[model samples]
Target chain A: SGFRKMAFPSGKVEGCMVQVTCGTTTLNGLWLDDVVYCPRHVICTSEDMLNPNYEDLLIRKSNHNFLVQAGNVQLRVIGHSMQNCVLKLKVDTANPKTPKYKFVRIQPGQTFSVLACYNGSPSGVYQCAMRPNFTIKGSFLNGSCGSVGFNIDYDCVSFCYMHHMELPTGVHAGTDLEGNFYGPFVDRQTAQAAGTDTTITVNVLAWLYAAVINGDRWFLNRFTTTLNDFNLVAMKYNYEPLTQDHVDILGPLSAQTGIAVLDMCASLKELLQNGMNGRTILGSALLEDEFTPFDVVRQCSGVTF
Target chain B: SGFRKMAFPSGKVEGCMVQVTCGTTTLNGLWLDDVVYCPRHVICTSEDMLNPNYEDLLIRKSNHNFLVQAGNVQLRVIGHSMQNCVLKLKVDTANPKTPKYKFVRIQPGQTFSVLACYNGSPSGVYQCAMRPNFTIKGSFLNGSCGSVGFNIDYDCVSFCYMHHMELPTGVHAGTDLEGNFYGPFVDRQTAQAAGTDTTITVNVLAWLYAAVINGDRWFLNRFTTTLNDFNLVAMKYNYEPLTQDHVDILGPLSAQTGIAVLDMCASLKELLQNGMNGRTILGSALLEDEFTPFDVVRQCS
Candidate 1:
């Protein structure tokens, strides 16, 4: 007889047999050699084969590990082709009559996967049953393809380690193990004193520059499109820094033309106080000159008058 | 010698005489006849004109003997030619500086006529100026063109009675009054006895009918084109309302199918209630029924 690769609804295999049967027999078996299994499915014994413990069969993975610590967990189901396929997860598994199993109706060519976490019980098992749907083909019970098992490791702690430390001196700070020196401490402290403390204050500007240069290209593309475009086109033209020449001309002009000119000058001064220089220029000098004739005329005329 | 006509800034006129002299020396005495004086040159006089009393003018014609009443009124120094002239009815003529008058501006080329009701005193004289901007010459003043007067009598009242008495029941009423009727009174007494208090309520039903009938025609035309040309041939068979029986079946069927069905039924009900039943049927039935079973079976099956 030629060997044929068999298929099962739950996508599992067990024992040396990889058990297969045909027709109406309630329990039957066959033997096969060296069948492989995924890491999720390693639970099968003589006792479990005779009387399957469905609660110990199904498995769940957490969406975010931090969420498990916060006691917020959700369990999602994976659907198989069998209508009576039931998945029993822990925390709700003891009462078989009201099993914590989710019923999913997967069509012939369809598949489903769910996300879950353990809220009540930090660690528990999940299981599945082929149940009443297998009654017609009773021999399928010994087919050894229904259940699989996995474990949840919720006790793992997430942490990070630093190799060095640094101290702050005025605006300057100490260096870490990486030999990165932080200084130009403008207020008072000397560079020698800045190296004394073991704790280091991170350079926020350096961090931001590193993030922008090394971040995902797609993310940087979106940031430039949204923020940089608005800054160059909208804010920069309306609120540019004023020179001393501007204050001299606009101070008297504002007195003559009410205080609108003075108010605009004040607004530009505020923008310069914040760290937003060298960002962008709005347009070409020639185009800007032609376009701003009306404003220039108004300002000059108001001042001269 | 020929009779010459003279033109003034106000209007044109014919007949005045010429007397020429040099340095206060009498050269000739030229006799002028039929002289036409324009509005600016003519000085209106109250010297020979008598202001008629107001009480005698408004008396009912049946009690009065005469066929007409006439009065002579006056207009002193009429103003210059006005492009857009206005004639004001003034009560006080004594104080020309602050005359009490109602202002009415006139448009060029439109004619208006007024009746002068003069009382003995200038204060009682009410001159309702008519035909103020009828001509380009100037504003029309009383007695400027021949002897102008208002003639009111029984004959004028009887003339209106003869023409407009039977007008409401006439054929022109259909073109003029395209609406509802309360009753068809056979005679004046029948109309009166239907009750002097009986009121006729008018409603415009014809306009509402046209809107529904026209809408149905447009809907049916698009439906027919969509069935034959678009890939909706079979579904169209089930949906199209072709005949009276088709509409009877499909109208309620559509109402049961979905929310759109309810909307269509409500619209149809409103159209029928507003007297568009006959017109709607006439337009909807003419729609061609080309939809087939293939269209519906493919869609639902």
Candidate 2:
């Protein structure tokens, strides 16, 4: 059976098999949300399903592992296909939500913006891995295939990571390892007190590379096709590290453009302060440059501008 | 074929093509069920799907094509590569079927929703070609792969090109086969209905050149890179025609915010006409630029 090949992640994971019984009423459909506390890796399909707004009873077939937060869900069955269903069902509302982090990838240049909801981590907790080193990572969606990838700190609307940190409600340290980061950050004092220019600068540059240069689709997602200017510019020019002062540049460029130039300067300061030099540090800190956003820019010669 | 590439739209469609037959007959095991006379297209044999529990039913074992609305259609052919048989099936009773759309787009933007039971346009309704005229197209999605893009009317959730036209839905005469517009809307009855000029405008800008400029890719698709802002600002400055109320400040502002500041404000008032001129038209026709989501002041260089 194809089901046999599916392995359940029992050791600290959300993958599991769940047994749900809601009277004799049974139906076929898919889950609207993750069922909490599932015991095995479950992959449900429409053929093996549940209709949320169905009659006859509660419970349905689903794909993947997810447990319902509600307990003793009292389903007021609507109807039947083979059986029943419900959406506005009764489940334990008292259970505290699983806390988690949402790792976000921002350009190194965008450090001052306030924090906001992110499309990075799911359920919200901090634990994604470091990929861009400039940016970061998590499973599936920096969490899972079906998790929320947007809106990190619901408290702040559209603010950024650094901005969020500046808030009293925010933290200074996070560890996806150096920061197994996700959800609202925790233990900032300790994480920051323990951190160094290495981790901070590394993370900042890595994210920008991924967000801007690489333009990782999973992170920022697909923008509509505008095969014209900005995209071309971003791909064409390799920022030559800022030379002019912020005030001087600010008098000339756009918000995003102006900031980017400064970020290049900031990145250099980060590398230098950490006692690093040359492109080798970059080569070593990052696994491959060919795939780097910086590399993408250097080679993108076709842009019309 | 407008009709040629369109061979699948079929003669009679998924309707007349289905043929089924079963007797007191039985294969290893399965049910002889009722042929669900759907008011719509139905295809999916009584195998792989649909379990069987039946009495001396009148049907099952349909030809390559089987139609159903929904019911108990069980099959336990168990394992013969090819079974030469048909059967009858059972049912509990008539119940309400599930309702939903396909939400299919092997990509995200072009949401061409098909009902639960759809067979592409292999004889489907919906011409899906006229322009939302408001909508802008492609990113990594519509740009790549050969595919038709569509948007369903939220009002009823099913209307297509022809229907959008029926209720003052037509564009102010776009020229796709000239200007060729459709997809993201430009104006609508409400914000929820019309959306921001951002999607239309931003899309118009990004894909205009960057998205297109970097078509370095062979087919329409995605890119995983970033470039400086100035490049984008510069290229955006050169488009020959200014779209309507949008002005031509890019020529001058290219000196200030590099390019973005200009691009932001460039999307301003479409234009002036007739006996009207200057700030009067700008005043009566528009509100504060501060309220304008695209105001350049939000980041004056």
Candidate 3:
């Protein structure tokens, strides 16, 4: 969904993210919870260059890119050319005319590791570099996923990493998965067998978490696609491939509730957009509308999950 | 963005939600976070009506139907005629065969209130409804938006609301926009004047909180779309529209650093996913891949 074009209100201002030119290897779309457009110079194929034109697709693609080009992983982006000032940057967009350091000093050569995933298993570890040589980059951009390609929709896509001044200290979006998560979560069979409204909430929740962590334009867009897909499936309640008959079934949801949902979406987006501006890295901010509709149901049912 | 179709692993388990039947009220999608469909009745409108319907644009369209012909903002759905047996769910997907609640029973009326606002002024209190109408019921399943439709690329869509069995005492995504915030907070002009990665992280964290709280299929899809839109904006470093020339300027950043950012996204998702499943919530469950990449950067830089 993000791959499509965007429209900002007139007068909306801009920020100054870092511009890294580590030697000659410029990057394309960094995984920094925001869109770090792959620096233009960073071509996809060392031998077979990916056009800058296709770069947006790269941006709109998945979160499976390894941390490093090779097996190792280590890297940087300092500001002020002093004290890794990048950590203390406050180049306010409102004051764009004012002078601020527009440079990022990073080390050259391939860094150590990343997912070591997506295309494969997972390194989960921060080795730095990734092993490459796949045509999936272009094909995926072309909207084609062959036998082997990036999995844009899985929980695997959520790699919401964060950074302060130096290297990023966090590896995952949250703290622990196995330790806290209630298994049997989003169990498809469970949803299908009972097929009730409660199950409806669960899958929706399931997909939300996945989408939030991935946060990549490609991943996020697909997340919405999945949601819409699920909506169609939900409407059918039959779970079979949708048919023209099914479309007839797809009507507007409760005008109020659907609006509520959209309202929730709006505030949620507002919160993120505002936070992304400078101070929301650790779930420490909350600048949007949020409330509950859950009380009505919970009070009556044995449904305490 | 969240209106497209999906592919499931052959044996993935599914769960049951509610199907409104108030007088004659049926709902389409929901508003927990993103747009969630009511599995029993929604259908996309298309030349084909989009069976699977190639009907994503359907997802992109909406407001609320709260199930009424003339449409009043009121509705509900429950079977067994029980008193919201619907609320207590967790028919473990892992244990599909386990005999559990195959039903819901609840009263109907308007539920409660919601975020009350969007990209403009506040609608902060009750009214329990919103505005609009469109139908991609399940086709075109479009990822496309017009010059002024969904603002698919802007942060106008992340209304993730959290729910615990207990009454959620929290309102707003955070404590205070400025009180605890590092820089001047919520000053749009200020942020635009100085959009940095920090601003990027802040909004992400902001949405994460919302997603964590809301944690439902309906909300998350929209949350991701919002995040993606934000990501695109973040990349431009220029919040304005991306010109053909500006597009040329867009490129990758330090690869390793990008990966580090993703690592955070993983754990953040993990935290919320687990929390909603009855664990890791309120910033308590910190057991994923979180370390300190920043530390690595500090020592040398």
Best by lDDT: 2
Please write out the lDDT profile of model 2 over residues A191-247, one tens digit for every residue: 322221122322333334433332221212122222232223322333213323322
Using lDDT as the measure, what is the rank order of every candidate, best first?
2, 3, 1
True contacts kept of each: 0.00, 0.00, 0.00
Model 3, stretches more than 4 Å misplaced?
A1-305, B1-20, B28-199, B203-301
Go through the candidates in order and give each one's DockQ: 0.00, 0.01, 0.02
Q: Would you give me the overall lDDT of model 2?
A: 0.22
Distance from true location, Cα of A67 in model 3, Å:
28
Chain B structural similarity as TM-score, candidate 2: 0.21
Clashes of each: 19, 142, 188
Q: Give the per-residue lDDT of model 3 (tens digit) for A1-305.
A: 11100011101001112232323332222222222322222323343232233334234423323122211222222211111101121111222312221222111111111221111111011212110110000101111100111111111222211111011111111001111111112211112111111122321222233223223212122112234644454344322232333222222221312322333233333433343343331232322111012211111111111
| Candidate 2 Cα errors over 4 Å, as ranges | A1-305, B1-202, B206-242, B245-301
In terms of lDDT, the poorest run of 10 residues in model 2 chain A is: A1-10
Better of 2 and 3 by DockQ: 3
Q: Give model 1's TM-score versus the native structure.
A: 0.11
Better of 1 and 2 by TM-score: 2
lDDT of 3 by residue, B136-233 (tens): 11100011100001100111222212111111111111101011211222211111121221222332332332323223222133122233544464
**Model 1 docking grade:** incorrect
Ranking by TM-score: 2, 3, 1
Among all candidates shown, the one with the greatest TM-score: 2
